Amino acid sequence: FEWVVRIQSTVETQLLGATNTVPQQTLNLDISFTDDSTTITPASIPGSISM
Amino acid sequence: FEWVVRIQSTVETQLLGATNTVPQQTLNLDISFTDDSTTITPASIPGSISM
């Protein structure tokens, strides 16, 4: 229960004046895609569910 | 009579528009630390030495 499609996305900074170059990071989004979970509850409030 | 502690210090220039990169220099200070020398003289002038 760990398989997850991922969506790579990176950031690179760039500027002159610094000693050496800055390594890039990887801001990636993940999706669980296997694990289960409940989502249905019996509680309610006025607008929670309408007929 | 040459041993000398040295104090490294460098300069790097950086700019875009030039053909190739500029190599850095090493502006370092040195201290003699071994050789001898006289420093005491008998001459004087008004404020040179006070009692």
Side-chain angles (χ1 to χ4, degrees):
Chain A
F1 60 99
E2 289 79 2
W3 287 71
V4 294
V5 59
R6 70 174 41 264
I7 299 178
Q8 289 281 62
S9 165
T10 79
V11 299
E12 293 179 353
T13 187
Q14 184 177 1
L15 65 82
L16 56 87
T19 57
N20 53 14
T21 66
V22 179
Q24 70 276 17
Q25 283 65 239
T26 58
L27 167 62
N28 47 28
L29 188 153
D30 292 75
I31 284 158
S32 67
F33 157 73
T34 290
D35 187 359
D36 291 331
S37 53
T38 75
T39 47
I40 185 166
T41 183
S44 306
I45 68 172
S48 49
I49 204 178
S50 52
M51 91 189 287
Chain B
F1 60 99
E2 289 79 2
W3 287 71
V4 294
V5 59
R6 70 174 41 264
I7 299 178
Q8 289 281 62
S9 165
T10 79
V11 299
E12 293 179 353
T13 187
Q14 184 177 1
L15 65 82
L16 56 87
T19 57
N20 53 14
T21 66
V22 179
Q24 70 276 17
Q25 283 65 239
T26 58
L27 167 62
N28 47 28
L29 188 153
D30 292 75
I31 284 158
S32 67
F33 157 73
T34 290
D35 187 359
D36 291 331
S37 53
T38 75
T39 47
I40 185 166
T41 183
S44 306
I45 68 172
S48 49
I49 204 178
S50 52
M51 91 189 287

